[PDB]
Design a protein around this motif. Structure first.
Motif: not given
Ligand SMILES: [Cl-]
Ligand SMILES: [Cl-]
Ligand SMILES: [Cl-]
Length: 163
Positions: A11-17, A146-148
């Motif tokens: 659960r986090m921003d995919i841009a920071k994968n 995901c973000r939720d």
């Molecule tokens: Cl994040």
């Protein structure tokens, strides 16, 4: 391949994968867009050169040596449930082809058509099952973003139940 290919959810921003390549939840026109697409445009703007591709397809563009796989899910506001279901399944099969072609050991994936393309419906199970159908035959480590918090729980539950 990965030594023991796995599915994980974060659960986090995919841009920071932390994976060897990313799947963008793209629009067909290669525009910066909204949501995942905007975050990908901000992180990898070079990857949007000639990224336009039809619904149900995936097109990879390199940002340096880092692969961005632009996967175009259907907008369920425009498609019938049946035709949208067919195109959503197809986009994920094209992602599996690209991940295989690239020879990566890991890939960061969002759930296609679950955001502003969902037609205001909950499509977690529909989108996740099409993801599994496509990626199960691949030997890359898959990390779903995901973000939720409640989607994180549901996705984690669906992964664990098949192991
Ligand atoms: Cl994040
Ligand atoms: Cl979406
Ligand atoms: Cl989410």
């Amino acid at each position: 391949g990965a030594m023991a290919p796995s599915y994980r959810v974060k659960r986090m921003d995919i841009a920071k994968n932390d994976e060897e390549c990313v799947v963008n939840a793209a629009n067909p026109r290669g525009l910066p867009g909204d949501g995942v697409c905007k975050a990908v445009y901000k992180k990898w703007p070079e990857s949007f050169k000639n990224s336009a591709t039809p619904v149900g397809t995936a097109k990879t563009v390199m940002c340096g040596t880092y692969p961005v796989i632009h996967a175009v899910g259907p907008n369920f506001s425009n498609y019938t449930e049946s035709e949208g279901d067919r195109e959503l399944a197809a986009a994920y099969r094209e992602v599996a082809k690209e991940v295989t072609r690239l020879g990566v050991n890991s890939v960061a994936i969002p759930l296609l058509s679950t955001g502003v393309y969902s037609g205001g419906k909950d499509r977690l199970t529909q989108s996740l099952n099409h993801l599994f159908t496509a990626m199960d035959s691949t030997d890359a480590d898959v990390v779903i973003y995901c973000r939720d918090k409640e989607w994180e729980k549901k996705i984690s539950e669906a992964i664990q139940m098949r192991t």
